Structure 1
């Protein structure tokens, strides 16, 4: 599923992402925009370390989900990476919440540092009624 901007904002809010660990809804929106373009079936194989990023939040298989084919893979979230390619994003959200409970926080995603960090991200939630 490719989410429309405001539809995603409302969904994330209902799922309790607004201000989760100090992270604004606008920041979560910015992350999803650049990671997958709000597409839940987005997958990205990293040829360099043999891991794959899954879903709307591009959650990595070495730490937050198990896909069986990733070397040195840990399962901090305990989810199958398959759960992060569904149309329903409840599992992707729970995984994202777990990921930011590490001291790094949202900075774990380099895309966040490059295009969201220290920027005006209001644009991602403007007009959505959240």
Structure 2
């Protein structure tokens, strides 16, 4: 499913993402936007290390979910990577929360640092009723 901007904003809010570990809803929107264009079916194989990024937040199989084909991978969110490909983002949101509970917080995603950190992200939630 490819979410519409405000549709996603309210969906994330209902899921408890607004201010989760100090991260605003606009930051999460900027992340999802740059990671997958709000596409839950998005995937990216990394030939260099044999891992794959899954879903709307492009979560990596080396540490967060199990796909059975990533060498010596971990599964910190304790989910099949398949769970990160559902139209319903509840499992993806649970996993994203798990990622940010670690030291780096939202910085765990390099794309967030590149296109959201120290940027004006107000535009991502304006007019969404959040």
Query: TM-score, length-normalised on structure 1?
Result: 0.99
Secondary structure, aligned partner of 1:3 = coil
Unpaired runs of 5+ in structure 1? Answer: none
Secondary structure, aligned partner of 1:65 = coil
Question: How far apart, CA to CA, are the structure 2 residues paired with 1:40 and 1:65?
Answer: 15
Q: CA deviation at 1:72?
A: 1.7
Q: CA deviation at 1:90?
A: 0.2
Secondary structure, aligned partner of 1:79 = coil
Q: CA deviation at 1:81?
A: 0.2
Question: How far apart, CA to CA, are the structure 2 residues paired with 1:110 and 1:75?
Answer: 20
Structure 1 runs of 4+ with >2 Å offset? none
Secondary structure, aligned partner of 1:52 = strand
Secondary structure, aligned partner of 1:66 = coil
Which residue is equivalent to 1:26?
26
Q: CA deviation at 1:8?
A: 0.1
Question: What is the CA RMSD across the aligned residues, in angstroms?
Answer: 0.5
Query: TM-score, length-normalised on structure 2?
Result: 0.99
Which residue is equivalent to 1:84?
84
Question: How far apart, CA to CA, are the structure 1 residues paired with 2:23 and 2:89?
Answer: 18
Unpaired runs of 5+ in structure 2? Answer: none
